[PDB]
C-alpha cells in the first residue's frame, strides 16, 4: 500500500509582511515538491530527482494551483481572526493536510482533508467524504457555509479520483526510489560503567520506508523494563535511522537479544554480543 | 499533484 499527502502551513505576520506560506508533497516517506512564499523563485520546486522529469507544463500548473492555496489561507487567517475576535497584533497558524491511501492493488482505500488553527483541529472530512466534523461554533459556521456550497462533493472527486491517478503516475515514473525497500544495516555497540551495569545499542541504519520495530528480549522473553528507544530519524539521504538501548548486569551481555522487523527484510533479524 | 478543484475559504 502507498499514499500521497500534501502539507500546507501558512503563518500570519503582524503589521508589515504577508503570511509566510510553506507547502510540501510526500509520496510515502519521500518529499518530491516544495513551495516557499519567501523563496526567490515564487515557483513549485522539486526535492526528489524523479519528479524533475516533469515538463514545464507541470511546474507552471503546480505553481498556479499552490499559489491559490496560499491566497485561500491568507483570507482564512483573516476570517478566523474575525470568527474568534482576535487582535491584528496576534500571529496565527493555519495547517491544511489532504491526500489519498491506495492498497497493494493501487485502488482507492482512504481519502482525508484535515484543517487546523493554532495547532488545534478546526474542521475535517469524515471517512465517507460527505459530512464535516467541526471543533467549535467558528468551525460550525464554516461547516454550514461548506454544506450549502457543496464542498465535500468537489473535494471527494479529487480524493477518490485525481489524487489516486497522481499517485500511480509518480509510483510508475519514480519506481526506482518509491517502490524500493532498503533493508536496515544493523549492528550493536557495547558501553558500560565499572561493575554497576552494561548497555547494548541495537543500531538500524540506511533503511526505507520509515516504519520499523526494534525490540529487546531476555532469554527469549520480551523486555520493556530497562530499554531506551529513540524516535525514528532521517539520515537526510532519503533513508532513516533508529536505535534501541538496554541496561543489564555486567556478564549477562549474551543473554539479551535484539529483534528487527521491517518491510524490506525477508524474516525478522536477531543480534547478540 | 496539488488539488485542482474549487477553493473554499472558511
Amino acid at each position, epitope marked *: 500500500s502507498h499514499s500521497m499527502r500534501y502539507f500546507f502551513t501558512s503563518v500570519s505576520r503582524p503589521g508589515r509582511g504577508e503570511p509566510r506560506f510553506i507547502a510540501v508533497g510526500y509520496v510515502d516517506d519521500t518529499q518530491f515538491v516544495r513551495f516557499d512564499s519567501d523563496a526567490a523563485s515564487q515557483r513549485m520546486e522539486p526535492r526528489a530527482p524523479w519528479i524533475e522529469q516533469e515538463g514545464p507544463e507541470y511546474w507552471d500548473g503546480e505553481t498556479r494551483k499552490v499559489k491559490a492555496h496560499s491566497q485561500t489561507h491568507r483570507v482564512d487567517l483573516g476570517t478566523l481572526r474575525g470568527y474568534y475576535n482576535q487582535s491584528e497584533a496576534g500571529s496565527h497558524t493555519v495547517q491544511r493536510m489532504y491526500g489519498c491511501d491506495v492498497g497493494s492493488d493501487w485502488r482507492f482505500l482512504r481519502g482525508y482533508h484535515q484543517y487546523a488553527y493554532d495547532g488545534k483541529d478546526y474542521i475535517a472530512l469524515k471517512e465517507d467524504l460527505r459530512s464535516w466534523t467541526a471543533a467549535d461554533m467558528a468551525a460550525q459556521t464554516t461547516k454550514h457555509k461548506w454544506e450549502a456550497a457543496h464542498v465535500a462533493e468537489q473535494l471527494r472527486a479529487y480524493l477518490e*479520483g485525481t489524487c489516486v491517478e497522481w499517485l500511480r503516475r509518480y509510483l510508475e515514473n519514480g519506481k526506482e526510489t518509491l517502490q524500493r525497500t532498503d533493508a536496515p544495516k544493523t549492528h550493536m555497540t557495547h558501553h558500560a560503567v565499572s561493575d554497576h551495569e552494561a548497555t547494548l545499542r541495537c543500531w538500524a541504519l540506511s533503511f526505507y520506508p520509515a516504519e520499523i520495530t526494534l525490540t529487546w528480549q531476555r532469554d527469549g522473553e520480551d523486555q520493556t523494563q530497562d530499554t531506551e528507544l529513540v524516535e525514528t530519524r532521517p539520515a537526510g539521504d532519503g533513508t532513516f535511522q533508529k536505535w534501541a538501548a538496554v541496561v543489564v548486569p555486567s556478564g549477562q551481555e549474551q543473554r539479551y537479544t535484539c529483534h528487527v522487523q521491517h518491510e524490506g527484510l525477508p524474516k525478522p533479524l536477531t543480534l547478540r554480543w | 499533484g496539488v488539488y*485542482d478543484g474549487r*477553493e473554499h475559504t472558511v
Partner: T-cell receptor
Amino acid sequence: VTQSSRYLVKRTGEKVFLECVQDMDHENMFWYRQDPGLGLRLIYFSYDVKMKEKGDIPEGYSVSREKKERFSLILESASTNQTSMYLCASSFLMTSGDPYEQYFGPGTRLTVTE
Amino acid sequence: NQVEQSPQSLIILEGKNVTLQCNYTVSPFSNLRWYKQDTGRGPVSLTIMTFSENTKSNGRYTATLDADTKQSSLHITASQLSDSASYICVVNHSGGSYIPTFGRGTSLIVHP
C-alpha cells in the same frame, strides 16, 4: 457571454476586431475557432485580466484583455485562411467559482475574401 | 489530439438506440463532459462526470465513464429527429492549465 456580431465579411489586410463580453465576473476567457473536421481549436486563453497564453493556433491573431468583462480577438491582417466560425467562452478561477464550468457565446461567422 | 470520438459521423433510423464512444489520453484526469451542438450554435452541456461518478440516466440520455480504461459512452434510447446534432466529448486535465481538451465531435443524423 455575447460576441460583437454574428456575421462578418472582410477584405484581406483589414485589422478585424471580434469582441466578446460577459457580466458573469469570469476571470478565465477563451477565443476558439470551429472549422469542419477539426472541431474547436484554441487561438488564445486569458486566465485573468491583463494575462495572455498562446493556444493551439495563435499565429495571425492577437488579443487584448485590459478589462475583465471583455476579451478582444484581433486578426492583425485578415486572410482567406481565417474564414471560420469563431466561438468565445468564459469560466471562473478555482478561488472564484467552479473553474471547469466553461460557458460559450453564440459564435461568429467571418468570411475573409481578397 | 488526446480526445478521440467514434464514429466521426453516423446516420441512424429514428426509434433506434444509438451509442457515441469517446477514448481519451488526458492524464491525470479531473472531469469529462458531453456537449450537444446544433449547427451555428454554442455547445450545450448534457452531463459532467468525475472519476467518482460512473453512470447518469438523464431521461432518454445515459452517460457512462470508466476512468481506469479512459473511456466514456453516451447512450440515447429510442432516438428521434430532435436528437440530430453534433455530440462533443470534452476532458479536463488536472495539471493546472484550466484549458479543456476537446474531441472533434460526432454527427448524429436521425432519419425518419
